Write a protein that holds these residues in place. Sequence first.
Motif, PDB file in Angstrom:
ATOM      1  N   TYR E  24      89.780  15.411  50.356  1.00  0.00           N
ATOM      2  CA  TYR E  24      90.571  14.396  51.140  1.00  0.00           C
ATOM      3  C   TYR E  24      90.031  13.196  50.523  1.00  0.00           C
ATOM      4  O   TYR E  24      91.088  12.210  50.259  1.00  0.00           O
ATOM      5  CB  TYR E  24      90.256  14.503  52.599  1.00  0.00           C
ATOM      6  CG  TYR E  24      90.315  15.782  53.307  1.00  0.00           C
ATOM      7  CD1 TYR E  24      91.258  16.645  52.615  1.00  0.00           C
ATOM      8  CD2 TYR E  24      89.976  16.006  54.597  1.00  0.00           C
ATOM      9  CE1 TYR E  24      91.562  17.678  53.632  1.00  0.00           C
ATOM     10  CE2 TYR E  24      90.330  17.070  55.212  1.00  0.00           C
ATOM     11  CZ  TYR E  24      90.959  18.176  54.635  1.00  0.00           C
ATOM     12  OH  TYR E  24      91.495  19.179  55.420  1.00  0.00           O
ATOM     13  N   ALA E  25      88.970  12.871  50.025  1.00  0.00           N
ATOM     14  CA  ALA E  25      88.626  11.706  49.382  1.00  0.00           C
ATOM     15  C   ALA E  25      89.388  11.483  47.917  1.00  0.00           C
ATOM     16  O   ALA E  25      89.645  10.392  47.535  1.00  0.00           O
ATOM     17  CB  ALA E  25      87.086  11.758  49.120  1.00  0.00           C
ATOM     18  N   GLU E  27      92.431  12.776  47.466  1.00  0.00           N
ATOM     19  CA  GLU E  27      93.605  12.449  47.647  1.00  0.00           C
ATOM     20  C   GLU E  27      93.929  11.129  48.360  1.00  0.00           C
ATOM     21  O   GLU E  27      94.884  10.343  48.155  1.00  0.00           O
ATOM     22  CB  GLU E  27      93.965  13.576  48.950  1.00  0.00           C
ATOM     23  CG  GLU E  27      94.322  15.090  48.509  1.00  0.00           C
ATOM     24  CD  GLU E  27      95.616  15.113  47.632  1.00  0.00           C
ATOM     25  OE1 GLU E  27      96.468  14.149  47.692  1.00  0.00           O
ATOM     26  OE2 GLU E  27      95.754  16.544  47.488  1.00  0.00           O
ATOM     27  N   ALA E  28      92.700  10.483  48.654  1.00  0.00           N
ATOM     28  CA  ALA E  28      92.953   8.926  49.169  1.00  0.00           C
ATOM     29  C   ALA E  28      93.095   8.009  47.950  1.00  0.00           C
ATOM     30  O   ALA E  28      93.620   7.046  48.140  1.00  0.00           O
ATOM     31  CB  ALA E  28      91.493   8.678  49.803  1.00  0.00           C
ATOM     32  N   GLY E 129      86.090   7.202  47.566  1.00  0.00           N
ATOM     33  CA  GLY E 129      87.356   7.574  47.696  1.00  0.00           C
ATOM     34  C   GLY E 129      88.257   6.669  46.803  1.00  0.00           C
ATOM     35  O   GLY E 129      89.533   6.341  47.006  1.00  0.00           O
TER      36      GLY E 129
END
Lengths: 245, 254, 241, 210, 234, 245, 250, 142, 218
Positions: E24-25, E27-28, E129
């Motif tokens: 997720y980081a 993808e940020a 991120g």
Amino acid sequence: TSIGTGYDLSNSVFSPDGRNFQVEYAVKAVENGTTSIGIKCNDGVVFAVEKLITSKLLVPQKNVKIQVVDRHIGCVYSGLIPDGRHLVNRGREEAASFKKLYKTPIPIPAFADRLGQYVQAHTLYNSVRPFGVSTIFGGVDKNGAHLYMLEPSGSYWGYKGAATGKGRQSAKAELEKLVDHHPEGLSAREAVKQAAKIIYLAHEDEKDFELEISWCSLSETNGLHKFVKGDLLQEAIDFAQKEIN
Amino acid sequence: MQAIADSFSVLVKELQYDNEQNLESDFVTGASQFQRLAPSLTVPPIASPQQFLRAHTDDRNPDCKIKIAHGTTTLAFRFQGGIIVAVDSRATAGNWVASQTVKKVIEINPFLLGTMAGGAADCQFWETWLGSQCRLHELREKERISVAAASKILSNLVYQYKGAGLSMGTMICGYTRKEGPTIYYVDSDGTRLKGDIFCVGSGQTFAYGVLDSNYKWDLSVEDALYLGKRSILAAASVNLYHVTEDGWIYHGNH
Amino acid sequence: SAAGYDRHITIFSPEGRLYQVEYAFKATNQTNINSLAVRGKDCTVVISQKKVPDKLLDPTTVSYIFCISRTIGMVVNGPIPDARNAALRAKAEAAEFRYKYGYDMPCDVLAKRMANLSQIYTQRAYMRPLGVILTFVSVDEELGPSIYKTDPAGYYVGYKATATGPKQQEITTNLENHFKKSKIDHINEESWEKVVEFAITHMIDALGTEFSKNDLEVGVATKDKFFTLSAENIEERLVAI
Amino acid sequence: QFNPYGDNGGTILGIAGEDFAVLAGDTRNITDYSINSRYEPKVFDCGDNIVMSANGFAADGDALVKRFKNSVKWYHFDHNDKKLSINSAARNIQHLLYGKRFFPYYVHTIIAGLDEDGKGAVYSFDPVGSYEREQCRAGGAAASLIMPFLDNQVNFKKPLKYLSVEEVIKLVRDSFTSATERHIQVGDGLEILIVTKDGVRKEFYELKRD
Amino acid sequence: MFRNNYDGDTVTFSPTGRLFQVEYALEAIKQGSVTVGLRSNTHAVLVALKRNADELSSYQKKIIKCDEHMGLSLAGLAPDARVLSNYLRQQCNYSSLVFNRKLAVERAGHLLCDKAQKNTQSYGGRPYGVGLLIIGYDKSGAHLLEFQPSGNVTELYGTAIGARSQGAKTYLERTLDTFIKIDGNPDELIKAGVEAISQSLRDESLTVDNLSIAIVGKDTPFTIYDGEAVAKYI
Amino acid sequence: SGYDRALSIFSPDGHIFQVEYALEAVKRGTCAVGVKGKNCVVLGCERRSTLKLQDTRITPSKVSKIDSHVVLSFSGLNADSRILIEKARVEAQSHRLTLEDPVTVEYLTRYVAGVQQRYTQSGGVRPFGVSTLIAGFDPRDDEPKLYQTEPSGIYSSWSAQTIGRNSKTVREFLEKNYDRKEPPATVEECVKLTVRSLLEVVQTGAKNIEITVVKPDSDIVALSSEEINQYVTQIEQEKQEQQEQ
Amino acid sequence: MFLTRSEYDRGVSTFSPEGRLFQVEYSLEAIKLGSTAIGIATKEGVVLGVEKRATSPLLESDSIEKIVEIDRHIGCAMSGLTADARSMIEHARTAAVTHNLYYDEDINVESLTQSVCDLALRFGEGASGEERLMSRPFGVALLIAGHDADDGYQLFHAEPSGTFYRYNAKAIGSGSEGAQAELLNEWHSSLTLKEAELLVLKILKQVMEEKLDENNAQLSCITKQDGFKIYDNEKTAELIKELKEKEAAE
Amino acid sequence: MNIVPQDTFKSQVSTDQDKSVLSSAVPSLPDTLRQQEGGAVPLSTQLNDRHPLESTLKNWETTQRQRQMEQYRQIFGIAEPMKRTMEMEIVNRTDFNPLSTNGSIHRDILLNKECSIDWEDVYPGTMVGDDVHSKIEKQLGI
Amino acid sequence: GLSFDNYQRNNFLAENSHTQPKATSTTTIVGVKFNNGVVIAADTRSTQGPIVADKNCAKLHRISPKIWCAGAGTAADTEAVTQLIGSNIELHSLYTSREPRVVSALQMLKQHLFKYQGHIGAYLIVAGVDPTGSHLFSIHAHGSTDVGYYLSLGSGSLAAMAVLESHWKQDLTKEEAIKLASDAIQAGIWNDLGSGSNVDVCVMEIGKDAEYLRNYTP
């Protein structure tokens, strides 16, 4: 059952059967990594890595998969890149400290023990996470050539031949066949050729790949850890291609 | 656990840069040294820092000696509607040329004044610090700080370092609406006095006698200024300051 | 299986039990190997079973017997990472005792120290027990040959002879029958080699199907030194019945 | 008892013009009756057209200059590469000096540059931090042999305001030559830094010791 | 559904062996705009497309100067970018102060990797991120590095990160040998970079307000062109 | 929903529910009213009916003098009020020692609010479930000061404020009966207004009302039972006369 | 393919599947619950205006202080939780005073805004590497209006996320959408001080449910020669009357 | 690898060095009332005229612990000191007994002082403070 | 632990007008080792400076039922250190469930005395028996220990050492060892002014209970 519900959301927890599921999940994460093998010849070790092709924008001489911890130690890993880099840094620090203190290159068993203790220390508390890497390392010291493999649980063993990654089963079968065919001993160059053959065989799944090989032997490298020049690498690639077809 | 691992992992020790204070003071990690409201003072790491400083401060370059404010006559009195602060502008010989008169009086605020009568650096530094503290207090409370509060802050500060080697005696003079005009004397020994008439310097008995001869509460601005000038001249180029509720006003000789 | 908590930390279940300690106890039998410790007249012998399913594995690097000090040897039943952790801690404790009190650490004192550490692990909520069983064997200068076993629960006790593993009941019953027949709480032999041969024979008749020199690991503690036998020594002991 | 202090001699002089400033110093580093170096500069360009020189204990002066330069670098980092004024630099040096009140630097400091209006400005600092702005200041063990020469050959009330940079350089050179003739410590060289709106210019002259 | 039970923090693995918080980081990064970096044997340049909140707002500063020979451009979160830029500035300052030595680009990359890895294995701290592009010039020549906040650094001749950055990467891959052999002509390299970043635009045109350039070279210190200074490259 | 389990969790609509729950805990406490006059401040407090066997000599009073010129009443949990009052008294004495000047009303209100806010900045601590009214005069000043402080650390300046249980009725009564353009001129008018406001909720009357009057130059007077009874009787008589015609 | 419950929006250090921190979004939502604050920057000064929400007529008119003086050349307006705004204002004042003490000069408005944003970043890792200081992010938005010699008159918007912007005209609070639309429609670089004040009053009257007067709205300005000053009731009432007369005439 | 403790002297001083006890009216100055030391104890007096053995005794077991950790790092590796420090920190942080000062049993077991007595154990040794709330604030950092 | 409070006040009082009261400074102590044990003897007369304070002083301290010691120097320091080491020895013996050893007490005393860098003025002679045999050691106040067969200490230690050098041999019996120790103490008494009166004796043999004798000479 490989999915233990109710006993797999924290690190330092025993299952009713006495298992740690976070460590097993880390092992599963390792199993999806790239295939890396190591072969222990008569007077040295050989490391082989299957490298996935990437964009041409990368500098060819600044991205090497095989890591060097000390002048007599070679190391490869499969799993998470940050964890592998962290472990390589810890190993370099341990080797440097040992050499400074005792004025001699650190023996491979002592280095393996220190690395295994460090890895195992991360499975005792719920505020940390097990290393998602399996590491095949080795080298040459006064006692001879040593090759070890270390797992996310902190368990390490010495192996005649080791393999990890996606194509670990085929590589292990080829290593067993090679051990059976060479009950007395194996030379360094034959080990390099067999490592190239095993790496090429292990790629059964579409995607183009390259091969990296590394030597560490007394007769050839004078006890140091070196990479492979153009001639030997080309010969190994040609031998692997001939064996494929 | 990561910090614990890094602590036992291996030059910085010899440089003493594993400590936060050393990195901050050498401006390594940023300009946080110049952001401390309460400054940090270096002390020798020995069993006798005070004796060390006292021995080394009396030993022989004239330029590399701690400058001391000259014991010139300073006078202050509150008559009816302000405070008259009188000093003598008699410069001392040296290897320099002054672009202006010597600043023997520190302007803390547009409403506060102070005198050196001690060590020059100590007085300047700590009165600038006191001005900053008073400004912060006025911003917080939305009201002018009382002279008693400022004098008490300075007294507590100089008392915390009592015996270390500081040498300063100041007169905080201020006119507030609630209290009127007030004069306090703050010494480096923690002394804090409140008074109507203050005279200090090499010669102040004559000035005090002149004041006592012709002092009364029912004076005027011109009369008080003349009295201060006459007292300074008799104690002997007389700088005057008149402090009212609206602030201080400076007179070169008038 | 624990209902609410006790799946993570070591606190009392409604029945008044510590489930994590029991699970750590169950985790000790994963290696599926057995160890046996017996006392001679002036020596102690420990014998463990070696299994090498992988032909790529180097047999010489597989071991569960450690030399804590000059006189004390240790045998660990359970996974090897916790085994090595316990071995290092035992070495440190023995050396610290020697430095602090001016004489060598006895076996029972070391066992009690490890048991106290295990009690710490079983009571603290943020610490987990080590899923291993420790067996310290030595020849104390005041008590002769000595065997002491410590478990993950924090309990330690000395044995005339002992056996731990997935098949410990058979060996324990056979030893009990032998002691009842001979009416001696030890072995009446003056040489450690005969005690090693007796222990090998007992292991053979307990487990069954015999074993070779590469399927065994032997350690001997005398009044002077504790040492571990090699392949040639084990084979020579195997030859003598 | 270990003695942490020392002395290396040397002489410095700072003069303020009407549109320029001059800071000069003798380039000889000496221990007691011995010559460590015949060329060791003591005047440095400390950033935005500011020249600084600390005379006395060499190690203390080097440390103070290093700290001030790092502070200037962080000041540029923090505020959009804003140019640091001479008065702000003077207050920074005052705080740096007073931060060691109980373990003082054994130096006398002089800095020179241009003020906001554009006139030359010279600031003088005692070892503990007290500072003031002066037209001319001489430090070291030659000031009593340099200040009377300047007072005789020029007036600060030929007025100093009408002097050009060349005349100031000539006066400084003559005063330092006289001091070299009279004083044993002074000699072996003289480095002058001139600060104008165009920047900082360096000149060197050889004195009577080679 | 099953992923929802194993993404609580960075100390938890999924049954299949995945670390979802780090993913997720990573993808940020796509939430930020596009930045391009490219280097030759003599110079290294960065091109950034800045964004504003609205008409009355100013534009974000996507290029930060770390040292007279090294700089970087950001793509992703603001706090982590600020923290990492300050850390790199502190490291360069420490190296210069202690050794009078310019910090190497590879050393900066290794320090960033070591700092970023520790947040992906402990509890209480989320991973970074922000992707970074670091250009520098040292004794080994010109260097360009791509830093991914999982704790990874790659050395490459050219790259691009941010939203819709695949077109710029494809253009850089295609015209590789063309821009590699640009020595002693910084303007040509800057124009190549602007042309490469023009492939990632969508219903937008490069203007003097939303274009930022940075350059470093053998005799050229790290310089940032903004506003009219880039008007010649549009 | 699931966002009310900690003080450090924002709700999707932008609320912290634990603060609201602390306010709910406050709302159960006894009523406390403060009225600002032309030259005085009156603090009234409702007391529960004393039991037959309860001692009436040593019971702590609702209104506490933090300093010779500043008083403080509370509503909520009675145990936390003691901690807050002790901290306020210690801070007042410390400020007098450090600055030679007695605290202003706003300074003490800000200190109490800061303590309450600081006790909301950790997950291992519980905020004070107390809302406070602070009244007084600034030293050498003739301007009455009345402030209200809430558990979250927010404070405000009021001319007439009621906190506690059934405080909405008293607040409406004050809004319909108090005008800031014409504050009561005398102390007696302020006391009468406070009594009439309290009688809206108090079931019995004079035996459940406590009144403290603060006047400049540090004049703090706690009214006795007889005076409050006289006020209550006069108010009841006036009400009966008004209702008759 | 079943509907379960997702819990990625409850921790300040937990990413969403797309890489978002929802606690910052919820803090902005908390900000949107405050009163309206409008700032307009011109070439003759910067104008700030706030709305006062008196929940009861017994509340003091001057008790509400949504406009504060950070320094003589820097003023601030706040929207959101007052408790966090108190700490932010205290930190800003301390930073300005310390900069004056150590450099003998006024601090740039951008420097103070950066310092405030660095403080707001304390719910995670700090800019210089300091550990966490607070459990949750702030719930306050700030409009910082200043004047310095380097960049003239400046207006900045500071958020709990640690990022600040420079605006010609900005609006925060409950009525932020309509006020921002009006500012976008009715702003130009040639505005004067009185025009900016009248525009701020007009927008405040538009976005306020209650009738605009001197007791529910507050105006302040900052200029070079006068610093930061908050208008009294009489001046604001006169401005409101002039605006009403102009509106009626046109 | 130290036997006698070293570097026990302060290098810098300030009026706000004691962060726990600071005034609220003037945050840059200490709070004399809440210090409860006597009211006439400036900090400078603590820098002179101290018993030479006081520093040696005050930090003696810490020096031996650090030397032991250094020996473990030299001989065993990073993991051993890391684990020892982690265990000690966990034990110290879990405990919170505002009404007592005696250490826990597990701390003594880890320190290997189960059957050891020193003068610290024999001798374990107001208007303001010394209550539960002050200790809670100190522990939690609020 | 031990408090350092009122150190500055005491220094001021000493330097201005007051004299600190003196502390008792304890006197011959001897230890003789024979073939199957040890004997530790001490003089029983204690004098406060030039004035005799007591004619029967018990200067023999007990660490363990078979480990005893006699100390010179500051009496309070000697007693406190001996009692602390005795408590530690008792706890250690309970923990190990074994008879305490002389080497353990020696190690504890040496480390404790080295901790305080000689500021504790206790000079000890420690004798005892344990499963390993009979042991006799001398401990200095700065933390240094020595091993010997016969040891002497105190003001009259030179006369006692002369007597020991005169009449000591490897093979000695219990009675001969007791007589030799008594003769050494008697010589210290007669030829020095620091010793007098009777003698306290403690005999520790292997396999037997320790025998304590008070006023052996009468």
